[PDB]
């Protein structure tokens, strides 16, 4: 059975207080995965679900705030001498999973102190994302790589990845590394860095994940009597912004091109994710809700990571075409939100069938239903778990 199986996952995965992305691969833990299987390991043990987290901030986060998207421990963890991380991070959605483990946690003395000991560290990456990656007080934040996006070959990028200067067990890097080689000639400074990349990109993911974390931060800070000065700040900009990225011509939330100044025309899973941060109006979700609807005419199982009907979709090639069960899940919450429960309804459906026939996959094809990359992958086991308490 599922749950059975995504326990196994989880705790073949685990190595202390945190938990790799897949099996096979070495011990090294990952900002987004964790924060995912975090949410997994409520269902198999509170403390370890707390540890999951206390273990990425305290082995990961530097005096500047930023999270990076990877601490290569290189070894097990107890639960709670500075491991080397990544230079760059990816989506924020830690704050909201810290909320939800603050409230349903059933002991309310551990719950107390670990997000009294959460809080300002969450605040502090919060921080650094704006300071850094908007000086200009927009209300949206910038990637500077594609890896930060958390999907990597988004179609979306193309363009953009085009313009620069020259994980997984189963065997574009030039130009990956080219950044990576300026950020280091830049001795990662920020400012020069937000200056100078030639990849700078306003995701709609990244940023509808930031402004949901945003909103759940706020409502942690209030819970726990903290000042949620600036929390505000980013919550009402964050609101402006998100929602200058929808395209009315095209009826969908597209990335922004901030080097070349213009929004990025392709339709992927990411333009659903405001859903999920709670902007749109009802109108704005019934016609995303009718572009879902569009995209399951030509795929079996919903929610194909780019529009099926796109010339860039591939059934099973990473993030242009393949469906993902952490992106299922966040947009059929978001659609739950708006009353859109059949289309929820249909998403977790696919998701669990998926994961029934095929185990817990990185990702599977939208035409066959087959699975794809990383076996034993952790957070389709853990949000099978979560998904189904």
Same mark, same amino acid.
């Given at each position: 059975?599922?749950?059975?199986?995504?326990?196994?996952?989880?705790?073949?995965?685990?190595?202390?207080?945190? !938990?790799?992305?897949?099996?096979?691969?070495?011990?090294?833990?990952?900002?987004?995965?964790?924060?995912?299987?975090?949410?997994?390991?409520?269902?198999?043990? =509170?403390?370890?679900?707390?540890?999951?987290?206390?273990?990425?901030?305290?082995?990961?986060?530097?005096?500047?705030?930023?999270?990076?998207?990877?601490?290569?421990?290189?070894?097990? #963890?107890?639960?709670?001498? @500075?491991?080397?991380?990544?230079?760059? !991070?990816?989506?924020?959605?830690?704050?909201?999973?810290?909320?939800?483990?603050?409230?349903?946690?059933?002991?309310?003395? #551990?719950?107390? *102190?670990?997000?009294?000991?959460?809080?300002?560290?969450?605040?502090?990456? %919060?921080?650094?994302?704006? %300071?850094?990656?908007?000086?200009?007080?927009?209300?949206?934040?910038?990637?500077? %790589?594609?890896?930060?996006?958390?999907?990597?070959?988004? +179609?979306?990028?193309?363009?953009?990845?085009?313009?620069? +200067?020259?994980? %997984?067990?189963?065997?574009?890097?030039?130009?990956?590394?080219?950044?990576?080689?300026?950020?280091?000639?830049?001795?990662?400074? +920020?400012? *020069?860095?937000?200056? @100078?990349?030639?990849?700078?990109?306003?995701?709609?993911?990244?940023?509808?994940?930031? @402004?949901?974390?945003?909103?759940?931060?706020?409502?942690?800070?209030?819970?726990?009597?903290?000042?949620?000065?600036?929390? *505000?700040?980013?919550?009402?900009?964050?609101?402006?912004?998100?929602?200058?990225?929808?395209?009315?011509?095209?009826?969908?939330?597209?990335?922004?091109?901030?080097?070349?100044?213009?929004?990025?025309?392709?339709?992927?899973?990411?333009?659903?994710?405001?859903?999920?941060?709670?902007?749109?109006?009802?109108? #704005?979700?019934?016609?995303?809700?009718?572009?879902?609807?569009?995209?399951?005419?030509?795929?079996?199982?919903?929610?194909?990571?780019?529009?099926?009907?796109?010339?860039?979709?591939?059934?099973?090639?990473? =993030?242009?075409?393949?469906?993902?069960?952490?992106?299922?899940?966040?947009?059929?919450?978001?659609?739950?939100?708006?009353?859109?429960?059949?289309?929820?309804?249909?998403?977790?459906?696919?998701?669990?069938?998926?994961?029934?026939? *095929?185990?817990? #996959?990185?990702?599977?094809?939208?035409? !066959?239903?087959?699975?794809?990359?990383?076996?034993?992958?952790?957070?389709?086991?853990?949000?099978?778990?979560? =998904? !189904?308490?």
């Amino acid at each position: 059975p599922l749950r059975t199986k995504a326990v196994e996952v989880l705790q073949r995965n685990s190595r202390g207080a945190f !938990t790799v992305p897949a099996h096979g691969l070495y011990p090294y833990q990952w900002l987004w995965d964790s924060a995912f299987i975090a949410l997994g390991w409520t269902q198999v043990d =509170w403390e370890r679900a707390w540890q999951e987290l206390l273990c990425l901030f305290d082995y990961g986060q530097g005096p500047d705030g930023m999270l990076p998207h990877i601490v290569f421990h290189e070894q097990s #963890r107890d639960y709670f001498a @500075q491991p080397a991380t990544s230079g760059i !991070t990816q989506p924020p959605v830690v704050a909201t999973v810290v909320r939800y483990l603050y409230e349903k946690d059933p002991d309310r003395d #551990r719950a107390r *102190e670990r997000a009294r000991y959460l809080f300002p560290k969450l605040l502090a990456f %919060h921080r650094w994302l704006y %300071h850094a990656r908007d000086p200009y007080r927009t209300g949206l934040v910038v990637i500077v %790589h594609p890896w930060e996006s958390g999907m990597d070959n988004s +179609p979306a990028w193309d363009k953009p990845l085009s313009r620069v +200067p020259v994980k %997984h067990v189963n065997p574009d890097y030039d130009r990956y590394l080219s950044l990576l080689y300026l950020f280091r000639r830049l001795e990662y400074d +920020p400012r *020069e860095i937000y200056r @100078q990349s030639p990849f700078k990109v306003v995701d709609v993911g990244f940023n509808a994940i930031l @402004q949901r974390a945003n909103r759940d931060l706020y409502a942690l800070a209030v819970l726990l009597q903290e000042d949620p000065y600036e929390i *505000e700040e980013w919550i009402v900009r964050g609101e402006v912004g998100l929602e200058a990225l929808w395209d009315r011509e095209a009826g969908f939330y597209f990335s922004w091109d901030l080097v070349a100044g213009e929004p990025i025309a392709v339709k992927t899973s990411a333009g659903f994710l405001p859903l999920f941060a709670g902007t749109p109006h009802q109108g #704005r979700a019934s016609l995303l809700a009718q572009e879902a609807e569009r995209w399951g005419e030509k795929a079996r199982y919903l929610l194909p990571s780019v529009d099926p009907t796109s010339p860039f979709f591939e059934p099973g090639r990473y =993030w242009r075409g393949p469906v993902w069960i952490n992106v299922n899940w966040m947009v059929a919450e978001g659609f739950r939100d708006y009353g859109f429960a059949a289309l929820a309804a249909r998403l977790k459906a696919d998701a669990l069938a998926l994961m029934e026939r *095929e185990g817990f #996959r990185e990702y599977y094809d939208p035409l !066959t239903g087959q699975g794809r990359g990383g076996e034993g992958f952790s957070w389709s086991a853990a949000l099978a778990l979560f =998904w !189904t308490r």
